[PDB]
DNA sequence: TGTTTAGCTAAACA
DNA sequence: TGTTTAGCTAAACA
């Protein structure tokens, strides 16, 4: 099977691609995951290495939240195997493989990848995706002031709906802003579309 | 070029303010399918004038035919919401074509 | 009444496709105060003419003097777009109110 | 010291599984892109499989249908795994909604399906470790007015709480909801819907005065 | 004395 | 052959 491990003999990773306000480390997130522990079990095995800089001690490569939720349920140890060849890539896939990481957790991610001279064909290789996929989280690195608002504040949260927006505002920004600057407006994939279609409709009534 | 059916055209036509003449033009070509053309050498009428005789009724029809609820607004909108309202106008303008072939495919 | 100054006037028939006798006949009477009968009697039209010549300069005007990023529209809609324009409206002409109360805080 | 290889030809998906067939993560673009990682990188999140009781040697999924077919379409012949025999259909709903793979339909169907064993919404709620307002709010998908239900099966609207909205509002005035959904550019969302409900408010105070 | 709107022309345009 | 729109009248209206 796998094996018990002691959880003070268990570190989260420092470098894992979820930071700390994500929301599945959210206080309610938690006290579920660990409800569910409590009474049934962890029943999903979390992976560890071998901390090779603290001998006997373990590093996780996935499962933080069940093991905060151990921590929660009160648990002497948790069920886990040993996998030492697993970096920071293999971590990125198996969150995006669970939909547990943001937008600006992809980004950043990206971000740290190009700083040390990767290229986007090797990023997109190395968690699986397109090069399209890296183009459109790169565009969240660098936004915008007032679309950067938007996005922080999470008036518009879809990486494909920014990346609408930012191509909008590159032609036309003082009518972006306009549309932005009211704080009725829904930022939707329709809402944006419809701007659009009306700048393009007013671009050729420049040319009319 | 377009078409009443007999029973369309006289809803159209309804407490309309408007001439014989108008009415018989509207009637040739609306009903009948004649060309406008006909009755402007007839008549001895510009083909503007018959145009816009045709024009009158047709108008008419379409405001009788609107759905309840439907109604004319104006207001002073941001430009994009302009645009919204415009669109808006063809997707209905699109819908009472097909509500009128559909009585006259009735009829 | 209706009046404008000469340089609302100017701004009015920027670009009208209107002749000489409209731009005289509504300069007479929007801007110079001319009573309407005045060119009705001296350019030998009807009262209807000259009404008509003062009323295309003034919606001109109307339109120009719209807010910027502003525009009228009129539709026939659906009751419940109805409700959006009339709402879009409202907070519309409330922002406008917060600009006009501003630039006269500042001037 | 480790999981172990299974080949695949002994194990079965369970036919029971919350998800559909229609599941987005069952498509294959999804699927595709899990051979590939799989295929470069290994399965490194090992699958739970119970041993099959009604047919020696076989295994059924616990969880981890999606590395399984991934792992097929890479071209492997086993997938690392280990056995839990005791593992049932709750924890597999828990499983799933931990990853937030369920679509509100396939939780509201999980849920109609424990209606008609006579279990009562309280200890489904315990079972899933969900609250009483969970449950409530997806009973509602299983019973939807005919056109709402059009709106939410093809996805004009996919979050429970505006459905939940929309029914209430179309238990009072259904021909003007029916009007509304009957526009296709209308977008539907907790906005949409809220201007919709003001404008209901506007006719219910013209029809008493 | 001014407004409105069916009805007409002209004449560029579709 | 049909449409558009400034500009004109007529004539009911306030």
Known sequence: ?208 | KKRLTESQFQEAIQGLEVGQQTIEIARGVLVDGKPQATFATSLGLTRGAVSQAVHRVWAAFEDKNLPEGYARVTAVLPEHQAYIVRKWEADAKKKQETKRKLAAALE
């Open chain 1, 1 to 208: 099977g796998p094996i018990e491990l002691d959880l003070d003999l268990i570190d989260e990773d420092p470098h894992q691609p979820r930071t700390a306000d994500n929301p599945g480390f959210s206080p309610e997130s938690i006290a579920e995951i660990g409800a569910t522990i409590k009474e049934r079990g962890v029943k999903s095995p979390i992976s560890v290495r071998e901390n090779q800089e603290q001998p006997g001690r373990y590093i996780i490569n996935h499962g933080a939240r069940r093991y905060r939720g151990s921590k929660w349920a009160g648990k002497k140890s948790i069920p886990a195997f040993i996998d030492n060849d697993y970096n920071e890539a293999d971590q990125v896939i198996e969150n995006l493989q669970r939909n547990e990481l943001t937008p600006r957790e992809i980004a950043d991610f990206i971000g740290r990848e190009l700083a040390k001279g990767k290229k986007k064909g090797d990023i997109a290789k190395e968690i699986g995706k397109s090069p399209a996929f890296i183009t459109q989280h790169v565009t969240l690195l660098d936004l915008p002031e007032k679309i950067a608002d938007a996005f922080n504040t999470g008036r518009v949260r879809d990486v494909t709906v920014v990346n609408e927006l930012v191509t909008a505002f590159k032609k036309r920004p003082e009518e972006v802003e306009a549309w932005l600057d009211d704080d009725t407006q829904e930022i939707t994939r329709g809402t944006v579309k419809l701007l659009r279609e009306f700048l393009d409709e007013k671009k050729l009534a420049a040319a009319l």
